[PDB]
Write an enzyme that holds these catalytic residues in place. Structure first.
Site, PDB file in Angstrom:
ATOM      1  N   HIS B  41      12.223 -40.117   3.324  1.00 56.89           N
ATOM      2  CA  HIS B  41      11.131 -40.985   3.331  1.00 56.89           C
ATOM      3  C   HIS B  41       9.820 -40.551   2.990  1.00 56.89           C
ATOM      4  O   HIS B  41       8.806 -41.043   3.195  1.00 56.89           O
ATOM      5  CB  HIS B  41      11.310 -42.093   4.514  1.00 56.89           C
ATOM      6  N   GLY B 143       3.147 -38.507  11.677  1.00 60.60           N
ATOM      7  CA  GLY B 143       2.972 -37.206  10.808  1.00 60.60           C
ATOM      8  C   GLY B 143       3.881 -36.175  11.483  1.00 60.60           C
ATOM      9  O   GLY B 143       4.076 -35.073  11.007  1.00 60.60           O
ATOM     10  N   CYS B 145       7.352 -36.603  11.491  1.00 62.21           N
ATOM     11  CA  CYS B 145       8.480 -36.662  10.796  1.00 62.21           C
ATOM     12  C   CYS B 145       8.697 -35.096  10.532  1.00 62.21           C
ATOM     13  O   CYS B 145       7.985 -34.561   9.897  1.00 62.21           O
ATOM     14  CB  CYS B 145       8.392 -37.672   9.977  1.00 62.21           C
TER      15      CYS B 145
END
Ligand SMILES: CCc1cc(O)c(Oc2ccc(C(N)=O)cc2F)cc1F
Ligand SMILES: CCc1cc(O)c(Oc2ccc(C(N)=O)cc2F)cc1F
EC number: 3.4.19.12
Lengths: 306, 306
Positions: B41, B143, B145
């Protein structure tokens, strides 16, 4: 979201951990530039921990008696000296993994990460606080001495603790990196008992702000209080007295959440007087006091380290 | 002595963390050999997280659209592919800090350390468990991820988690390093609610053994029970059913402490039925379930990592 007991990344410190052997005693040392720091009781034998005279025990030690091993390589000891309760072993090789670092003596209530080591090899990392009685509640087994506690500010490692002793009550005592013990403890196997383990009030309040930020708000009451009135409750529950300095330090968290510091004190007061009634706050059933205001801001804002 | 929530040393993983930017989205990637792994993503924009078609969104992406930064150096992307919910970005430079590693898909109840990162820079480390509902209770902000969870067996890093999503309830979901989500969660901003957060019974028992080892023995009762009789109590309190496999895994802790596993179950049963009456166990006022039997043995025996 989510709030966790969080330690600093330990990589910068892992590269500094060495194994120090003197006679039959092996513990951990910290290799910064061309000096290895370790507890001075590495020179002690079993019969000697009751009443060691370190100055006398050191007379029978030469540079070559200190075996320093980094990974699988032997470091050459070219000098040694005792500074308070640590030994400084001058080696002939500067540690190429030396990070930017400082030596800091922390105040009670301040937190730091511990890199537990055995035989110079890192085993794990966890977060600790310097208790008001100058002990720490760590996880240390035989051979962990020389493990260090530290803080990181971006790229600078601030070393603040070296582990030396475990008290009969299962708590832990140690020195700064200049070899001065925190509190009244000595590196002798003697009768030394820890004082009252008072709760770090400003840290509990910080943690309550962290809970609000993350959605736990059931403890927010309709009351306020004063510093003097709250401190009368703090004294009964063996809490540190809250000062205006503590209020000031909580300003940023107060501003971000819109809850006045004294309102949160009144919420804490109700929690102390009535307990939590089986509820939880940030996954805990007791009031946590090993998060500093700066720790909360760090974790709730995502500060990184280069 | 002392028992703490302990994470593995993060240095081996810190050297693998990179920053991946696609369009205006920046998150973390894991650089092993000449491949960078990151959540797929990263290619999504704000309007797209409701219902992304990743295959279609990837058609408009070339190697040069993926900006990969390790420290202050730009890595050259020479190929890219989607594997389930992760992207594999082939770079032209093998990571010189690549540790010995494996990719493992862990079972619920198993624990691991998380290295929280932002912009490819490590911020902190903490211990997590894969909940029976296949969520984790972490600490992640925007942030984070691409942050990974891992275990270490001496010198081999077993990567088991990559962080992808935060659910509306404040818990966290992610994938293994092959890109398959744990549980039923998807990388879409949709209505996905976590199931019952049952307690990991075998882990609580392990933690009770750790308490006994460290001097907390007030909860040891005079009773015993059977697996079927204990499980009738476990069901009421949303505890995992205990199996003979769980009993077998607790053998070593049973042998070291001399307390039969079923005796400790009867102690746990009393704690569930009567609470802790305001007492604490290993500094906790609730029953901890994010220590595995292997974690207890590791910390109570001092296992290190080379
Ligand atoms: C003479 C000074 C001295 C030397 C020691 O070698 C010592 O030994 C231990 C230290 C720490 C721990 C632990 N678990 O932290 C365990 C230990 F056996 C204590 C001690 F005061
Ligand atoms: C389309 C898939 C997808 C992309 C995202 O960029 C996203 O954003 C977040 C992810 C994690 C956190 C957190 N705190 O863990 C916060 C976030 F905003 C979510 C999400 F499903």
């Amino acid at each position: 979201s989510g709030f966790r007991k969080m330690a600093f990344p330990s990589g910068k410190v892992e590269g500094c951990m060495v194994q120090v052997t003197c006679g039959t005693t092996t513990l951990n040392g910290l290799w910064l530039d061309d000096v290895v720091y370790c507890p001075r009781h590495v020179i002690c034998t079993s019969e000697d921990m009751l009443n060691p005279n370190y100055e006398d025990l050191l007379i029978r030690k030469s540079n070559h008696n200190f075996l320093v091993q980094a990974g699988n390589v032997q470091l050459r000891v070219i000098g040694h000296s005792m500074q308070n309760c640590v030994l400084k072993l001058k080696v002939d090789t500067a540690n190429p993994k030396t990070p930017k670092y400082k030596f800091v003596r922390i105040q009670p209530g301040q937190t730091f990460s511990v890199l537990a080591c055995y035989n110079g090899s890192p085993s794990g990392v966890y977060q600790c606080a310097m208790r008001p009685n100058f002990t720490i509640k760590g996880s240390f087994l035989n051979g962990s001495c020389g493990s260090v506690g530290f803080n990181i500010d971006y790229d600078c490692v601030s070393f603040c603790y070296m582990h030396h002793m475990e008290l009969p009550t299962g708590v832990h005592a140690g020195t700064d990196l200049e070899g001065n013990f925190y509190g009244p403890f000595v590196d002798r196997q003697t009768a030394q008992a820890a004082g009252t383990d008072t709760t770090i009030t400003v840290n509990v309040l910080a943690w309550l702000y962290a809970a609000v930020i993350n959605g736990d708000r059931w403890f927010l009451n309709r009351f306020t209080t004063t510093l003097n009135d709250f401190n009368l409750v703090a004294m009964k529950y063996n809490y540190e007295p809250l000062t205006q300095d503590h209020v000031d330090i909580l300003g940023p968290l107060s501003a971000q959440t819109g809850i006045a510091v004294l309102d949160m004190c009144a919420s804490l007061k109700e929690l102390l007087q009535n307990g939590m009634n089986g509820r939880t706050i940030l996954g805990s059933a007791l009031l946590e006091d090993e998060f500093t205001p700066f720790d909360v801001v760090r974790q709730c804002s995502g500060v990184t380290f280069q």
